[PDB]
């Protein structure tokens, strides 16, 4: 059983905890409680092999930014989340990518760009804007909804695969 | 200066760890209730949601590790401040202890 160390990062309120909780526990949390740092664990089967997922759910609140360095050293792959109705979160993504790149001293860190809340009408960030960003980083882009489960397994398993195929 | 951060370990099978911001006046029972709220959708927690059924254990490295069960009404911040000692708090059912 291979263990995979996944880390979920991005700005406040984009849906990091909701995505993680949907994946681990199969329900949607509608209340908002800001995270400091939570660790989760699940055994899953991906392409016919049993895997252990260690998932670190991190803080969007800028108050906790000094915790980043440690979790970026230890993490094997990063889910970089923004919300498609939150233009600022899409701008903030770039700062997470650069820190991870700096911390790990590598241009080749396993990562997936996620545009979350795709169930909501009247998006303010265009899919193509995120596609262009992902292309420049050399990483997959996937849209998700923690509320409807759209793309959620795909986003996390794609990240496991990026680590596995590295 | 009114709050402090505590990491609680072995919380549930699906949620091994959580960090919470607690009032420094918090008892072990107060911190337990905050932790049960954080892990409230874990199946083991839905099954046993009453904080009075739990304890915090502190494990501290010497100057080998020692362990000690906190009293229900003991101040967690006082215990942490006394560590000699790299340390951790562990959530356990009283029946396990
Ligand atoms: N409609 C909709 N709401 C969502 C979705 N994902 C998260 N939410 C809601 O958005 C709010 C914030 O979600 P969280 O997952 O707590 O956000 P977070 O990124 O973990 O926030 P921090 O821990 O503070 O950084 C909550 O009220 C969630 O119910 C989604 O895909 N669709
Ligand atoms: Mg969160």
Which residues are within 8 A (CB) of A96 and not within 5 positions of it... i.e. 6 or more apart? A9, A10, A78, A80
Q: Are A11 and A88 spatial neighbours (Cβ–Cβ below 8 Å)?
A: yes
Our measurement of the distance from residue B55's CA atom to the centroid of its chain's CA atoms, rounded to an integer in Å, reads 7
Which structure tokens are listed for A145? 């909804």
- Pick from B15, B41, B42: which is nearest to A39 by CB? B15
What CA–CA distance (Å, rounded) separates A5 from A41? 10
Which residues contact residue B23 at a Cβ distance below 8 angstroms, ignoring those fewer than 6 apart?
B2, B3, B30
Q: Which domain holds residue B20?
A: 7-97
Q: Is A102 exposed, middle or buried (0-12, 13-18, 19+ CB in 10 A)?
A: exposed
For residue A96, what are its two tokens?
């997470």
Asked if residue B59 belongs to a domain, the reply is yes
CB A27 to CB B41 under 8 A? yes
How many residues are recorded in chain B?
97
Question: What token pair was written down for B31?
Answer: 């911190």
Is there a domain that residue B2 lies in? no
How was it solved?
X-ray
C-alpha closest to that of A20 among B15, B47, B45, B20: B15
Which residue CA neighbors atom 15 of ligand 1 most closely? Answer: A15
Distance CA A110, CA A55 (A): 14
Enumerate the β-bridge partners of residue A113.
A80, A141
Strand B87-93 to B3-9 pairing: parallel
Surface of B (30-59) touching A: CB under 8 A = 38, 41-42
Evaluate whether residue B67 is within a structural domain. Answer: yes
Q: Count the domains in chain A.
A: 1
User: 10 Å Cβ neighbour count for A101?
Assistant: 16
Range of the domain at A158: 1-166
The DSSP code for A43 is: E
* Tokens describing residue A26: 């199969």
CATH number reported for the structural domain that contains residue B64 in this entry:
3.10.20.90
Q: Where residue A20 sits, what CATH number does that domain have?
A: 3.40.50.300
Q: At which residue do the structure tokens 């252990």 appear? A: A52
| Number of structural domains in chain B | 1
């Amino acid at each position: 059983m291979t263990e995979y160390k996944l880390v979920v990062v991005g700005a406040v309120g984009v849906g990091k905890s909701a995505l993680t909780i949907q994946l681990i526990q199969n329900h949607f949390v509608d209340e908002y409680d800001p995270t400091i740092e939570d660790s989760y664990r699940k055994q899953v089967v991906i392409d016919g092999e049993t895997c252990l997922l260690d998932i670190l759910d991190t803080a969007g609140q800028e108050e906790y930014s000094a915790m980043r360095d440690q979790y970026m050293r230890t993490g094997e792959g990063f889910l970089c989340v923004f919300a498609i109705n939150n233009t600022k979160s899409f701008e903030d993504i770039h700062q997470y990518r650069e820190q991870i790149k700096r911390v790990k001293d590598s241009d080749d860190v396993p990562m997936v760009l996620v545009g979350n809340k795709c169930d909501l009408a009247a998006r303010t960030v265009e899919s193509r804007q995120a596609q262009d960003l992902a292309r420049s980083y050399g990483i997959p882009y996937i849209e998700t909804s923690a509320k409807t489960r759209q793309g959620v397994e795909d986003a996390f398993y794609t990240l496991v695969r990026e680590i596995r195929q590295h | 200066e009114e709050s402090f951060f505590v990491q609680v370990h072995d919380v549930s099978p699906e949620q091994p760890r959580t960090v919470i911001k607690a009032p420094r006046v918090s008892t072990a029972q107060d911190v337990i209730q905050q932790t049960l709220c954080k892990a409230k959708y874990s199946l083991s927690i839905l099954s046993n949601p009453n904080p009075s059924d739990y304890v915090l254990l502190e494990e501290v490295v010497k100057d080998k590790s020692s362990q000690r069960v906190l009293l229900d009404q003991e101040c967690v911040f006082q215990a942490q401040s006394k560590w000699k000692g790299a340390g951790k708090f562990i959530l356990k059912l009283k029946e396990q202890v």
